Design a protein around this nucleic acid. Structure first.
Ligand SMILES: [Zn+2]
Length: 198
RNA sequence: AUUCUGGUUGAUCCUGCCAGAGGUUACUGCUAUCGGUGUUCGCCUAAGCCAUGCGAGUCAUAUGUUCUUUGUGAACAUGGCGU
């Protein structure tokens, strides 16, 4: 594998080992073959195989919009989807796109009933809205599980979040918007302004 | 577990209901060994109609009469209480 950008040269030199220092570098993480060495423990799951099509003069174009979400079950998770003529190349392109979009989300115990403080649930209440699908990340008591959907359980188990209550608004049929709104909520987890004394 | 899934599209987002998925209640198809707990089994139609037995009777230290199995034993009556 030939690194191409400055981040690839830095990771091949050994200066950047984990993705946190790469994000601290501030450069664009464009090569899919950098995060695999930075995080060899990356895991992902295909979230749907919804087969799109398209109209032509003679026949009908066919593609696959398979989406795969990537996390590490510790506090890092990312979103990524891709399409191509075959399910294999489509899912592999989605895996390439997802690993470039991994982010670090800080976690704790902000539940009204839970009082542990050790990171097992969302730090506080946040929202994720991709399309009309919206998800609120209300904290949950420890040792309880995710009070969300099956794809929500997959995405939040990839992201490392353990116990959460949620709620869904709008047309929840689109699994792609469900994954993207969960991503938006997790990104709003670590963007709200916290007190300096906390 | 403060839960989603399919359906309108050539394909998407979506409003929108439809249907899926869990209780409980009533009834019921199929079907079947047993015990425990108690505060269920003609309510939902007919508060329709009823054969049969029965469900409130008791009082000898209230009065009165005949027996005896001689004893707060029974039968009758007036009467008290209760129904
Ligand atoms: Zn806790």
């Amino acid at each position: 594998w030939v690194p191409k950008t400055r981040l690839g040269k830095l990771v091949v030199e050994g200066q950047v080992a984990s993705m946190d220092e790469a994000i601290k570098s501030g450069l664009p993480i464009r090569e899919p073959q950098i995060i695999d060495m930075l995080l060899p423990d990356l895991e992902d799951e295909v979230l749907d195989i919804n087969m799109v099509q398209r109209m032509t003069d003679s026949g009908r174009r066919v593609k696959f919009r398979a989406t795969v979400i990537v996390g590490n079950r510790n506090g890092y998770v990312g979103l990524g989807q891709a399409k191509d003529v075959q399910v294999g190349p489509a899912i592999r392109k989605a895996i390439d796109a997802a690993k470039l979009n991994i982010t670090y989300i800080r976690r704790g115990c902000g539940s009204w009933e839970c009082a542990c403080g050790l990171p097992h649930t969302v730090p506080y209440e946040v929202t994720g809205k991709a399309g009309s699908v919206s998800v609120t990340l209300i904290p949950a008591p420890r040792g309880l599980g995710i009070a969300a959907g099956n794809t929500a359980t997959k995405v939040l188990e990839k992201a490392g979040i353990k116990d959460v209550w949620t709620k869904t608004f709008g047309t929840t049929r689109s699994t792609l918007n469900f994954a993207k709104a969960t991503y938006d909520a997790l990104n709003q987890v670590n963007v709200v302004r916290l007190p300096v004394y906390y």
